[PDB]
């Protein structure tokens, strides 16, 4: 990326503000909730345990963060709560479900791990980590790449080229925020420190 760190952004229309993982990479600005650092993360329906006997209904959407051969998922994106973990080179074989469901299978000891996606091209990706991690040795595991981030995960996302002004938001409260200014939209910002908002500042004049 051309640069990353978290922000603390908004007040939407409650004036809420939350810490958020922002990265500039490709003239797309975009935020997440927490820090994308992952083999692959993202929103997948599971039948919660690998229960059989749960409905598709009832399959709750989780959040997966894949990061060794421990594939766990959490209650959000934030990933404040962790909510299972399957150990990947356990399962007995992952099976490729793209073309009938979006999905992936987990196939355990006594029960199988049903994994939908959106999209066959998230179901073929997380198909494909999860066929690797499964069938890799500690050594040429450690040796993979964490995905780049993902704009489907992004609470939000913006063009760099779309933005008309990049200002010194000159607050008493929040001496690090700025205000980044486009023509259907307004979304503030906030660094830790004074010179993550000179960059910040700096590295999103550049489009437009």
């Given at each position: 990326?051309?640069?990353h ?10 004036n ?23 083999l692959?993360?993202g ?5 919660g ?15 997966f ?20 973990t399957?150990?990947?080179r ?14 992936i299978?987990?196939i355990?000891?006594?029960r199988t ?7 066959p ?21 450690r ?19 779309l933005?008309?002004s990049v200002?010194?938001?000159d607050?008493?409260?929040?001496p690090n ?7 259907n939209?307004v ?22």
């Amino acid at each position: 990326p051309y640069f990353h760190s978290f922000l603390y952004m908004n007040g939407g229309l409650m004036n809420s503000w939350k810490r958020r993982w922002c990265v500039l990479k490709d003239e797309t600005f975009l935020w997440f909730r927490s820090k994308q650092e992952a083999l692959k993360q993202g929103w997948l329906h599971n039948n919660g345990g690998g229960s059989s006997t749960l409905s598709r209904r009832n399959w709750k959407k989780r959040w997966f963060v894949l990061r060794q051969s421990k594939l766990m998922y959490f209650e959000n994106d934030s990933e404040e709560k962790l909510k299972g973990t399957v150990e990947v080179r356990s399962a007995k074989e992952i099976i490729d479900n793209t073309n009938k469901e979006n999905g992936i299978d987990i196939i355990m000891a006594d029960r199988t791990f049903h994994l939908i996606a959106e999209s066959p091209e998230d179901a073929s990706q997380w198909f494909s980590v999860l066929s690797q991690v499964h069938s890799s040795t500690d050594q040429e595991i450690r040796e993979m790449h964490d995905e780049q981030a993902n704009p489907q995960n992004a609470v939000g996302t913006l063009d760099v080229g779309l933005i008309d002004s990049v200002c010194a938001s000159d607050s008493p409260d929040r001496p690090n925020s700025f205000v980044i200014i486009t023509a259907n939209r307004v979304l503030h910002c906030n660094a830790d420190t004074p010179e993550e908002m000179h960059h910040w500042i700096t590295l999103l004049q550049r489009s437009k």
